Amino acid sequence: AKKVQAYVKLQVAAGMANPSPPVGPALGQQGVNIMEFCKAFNAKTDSIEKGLPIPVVITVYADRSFTFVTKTPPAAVLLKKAAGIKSGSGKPNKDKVGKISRAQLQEIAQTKAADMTGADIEAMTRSIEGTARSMGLVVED
Template sequence: MAKKVQAYVKLQVAAGMANPSPPVGPALGQQGVNIMEFCKAFNAKTDSIEKGLPIPVVITVYSDRSFTFVTKTPPAAVLLKKAAGIKSGSGKPNKDKVGKVTSAQVREIAETKAADMTGSDVEAMIRSIEGTARSMGLVVED
């Protein structure tokens, strides 16, 4: 018989840096999950990813207080900021441009995000990433 799902917890946790402090501790503590067990498992799974990169994670908590989790790829905005070498996007993206990314960088980001995106093909995903870049005040160059 399948375990009964008690809750789904969605968080963004820095790769390799999960610890019991907020946001992880309070979110999992409410559900009665062993926080240190999650932190160790998450840090082990994100070991190969650059430390500090925010990783979305969906934790499924079962009624017997056990859990499973699925990690996603980092948000497109974070990858674009890293590619452009900027700290944050523009407050007025249509007027103030804060950086540039090449179409090769956009393609690389789209291929990285392919597992999590719903686009039918790579070109659709590239257009989606380009739209994110424009909304952040980045210029996409050929």
């Protein structure tokens, strides 16, 4: 990327990208090919896993068709189906409700290795600290 022009990003779902009220039409509208979001999308989607959030960019100008750019998963959401609670609080942050794992955060953050700056790959865990102190949740470290 040496010339940004259009990078709309509103996370989607792997098993079936083909919505309508949330995104649907407007997820590829202004010179974009709506059809291609099942031919090219799922060409790197099911490569991994199906069901959960997936941010994304495309590279279409006014060139009709296009190639679909894969992306990372968010690093704080990996504190739900790979951790515990799925909301975030319930009880106002006057009291620190949640609860965290020290084992996890390493390899399960490591999953996001190719989207981070920390040279040391254990540093990258140190980043998931506050990101997973999302409520003030401390780890039985």
